[PDB]
Amino acid sequence: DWEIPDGQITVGQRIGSGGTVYKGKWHGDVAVKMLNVTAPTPQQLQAFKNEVGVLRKTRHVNILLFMGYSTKPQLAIVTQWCEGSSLYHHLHASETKFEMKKLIDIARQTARGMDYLHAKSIIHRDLKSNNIFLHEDNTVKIGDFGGSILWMAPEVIRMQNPYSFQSDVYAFGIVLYELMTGQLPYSNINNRDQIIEMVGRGSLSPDLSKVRSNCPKRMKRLMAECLKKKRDERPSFPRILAEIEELARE
Numbered sequence: 001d002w003e004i005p006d007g008q009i010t011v012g013q014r015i016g017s018g019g020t021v022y023k024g025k026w027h028g029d030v031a032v033k034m035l036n037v038t039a040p041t042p043q044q045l046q047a048f049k050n051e052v053g054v055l056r057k058t059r060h061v062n063i064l065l066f067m068g069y070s071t072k073p074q075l076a077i078v079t080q081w082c083e084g085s086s087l088y089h090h091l092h093a094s095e096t097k098f099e100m101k102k103l104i105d106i107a108r109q110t111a112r113g114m115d116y117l118h119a120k121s122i123i124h125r126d127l128k129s130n131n132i133f134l135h136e137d138n139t140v141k142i143g144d145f146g147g148s149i150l151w152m153a154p155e156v157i158r159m160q161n162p163y164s165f166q167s168d169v170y171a172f173g174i175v176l177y178e179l180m181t182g183q184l185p186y187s188n189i190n191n192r193d194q195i196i197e198m199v200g201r202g203s204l205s206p207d208l209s210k211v212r213s214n215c216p217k218r219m220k221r222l223m224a225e226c227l228k229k230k231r232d233e234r235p236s237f238p239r240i241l242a243e244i245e246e247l248a249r250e
């Protein structure tokens with residue numbers, strides 16, 4: 001089994017909270033995600049092992065690698081350590097001058113991981129650029145599927161059956177929007193309640209006039225399909241992947 005016994009992991013620097021993520025040492029570098037629980041009930045332990053079971057179904061280069069789990073001294077999930085920062089950081093904080101070639105590659109890699117998860121019947125539920133780690137600045141690692149409102153599909157935003165393969169697709173659409181515009185959607189409306197109301201009712205959607213000159217018109221159309229307010233009108237990942245790989249040639 002994939003349990004790591006007590007004392008094998010050396011916990012280092014805290015990364016962020018929400019439980020808590022640390023850098024650790026275990027046969028090299030790992031990320032250690034501490035759930036806020038020291039004496040699990042024989043009921044929490046079962047929802048934990050249940051979630052571990054989900055993570056263990058993934059083996060793919062664009063999905064954060066599951067490496068094991070801890071019961072003692074604390075419930076914790078152990079993964080590979082990623083170097084660098086999230087796609088969100090690159091796109092919106094540091095303004096990494098990515099050529100359109102790289103931008104497309106990132107989308108393609110994101111599409112690969114999502115298509116993979118969907119094949120294994122896993123709905124992400126929280127895809128956003130903060131959750132796409134750009135390991136060594138090259139490889140997309142999709143994490144955080146074991147504050148999100150800009151990526152929420154109208155049906156999800158309707159305060160709510162809403163989490164589906166198609167809500168993931170919509171969130172992926174917002175990610176394409178981020179990539180192809182360099183911007184977060186609704187940037188000229190800094191109002192959470194307003195966005196919840198307007199996106200929820202279908203009166204507001206991302207401003208597509210903002211996708212850059214360089215964006216293969218074929219990508220812009222694909223992004224529009226992913227963002228269909230009408231959930232059934234959205235493409236599936238197999239189709240999204242096929243599409244992105246083909247335009248990636250030209």
Ligand SMILES: CC(=O)Nc1cc(-c2sc(C3CCN(C4CC4)CC3)nc2-c2cccc(NS(=O)(=O)c3cc(F)ccc3F)c2F)ccn1
Binds near residue numbers: 033066
């Ligand atoms: C430099 C660095 O931060 N490296 C790093 C970080 C992680 C992180 S970061 C991070 C958060 C921190 C809080 N915020 C904002 C402050 C930034 C959002 C992202 N989470 C991870 C992380 C660590 C372990 C598991 C997950 N996700 S998970 O759904 O539990 C998961 C576990 C698993 F075993 C396999 C896949 C998987 F998605 C993480 F997302 C994972 C691997 N490497």
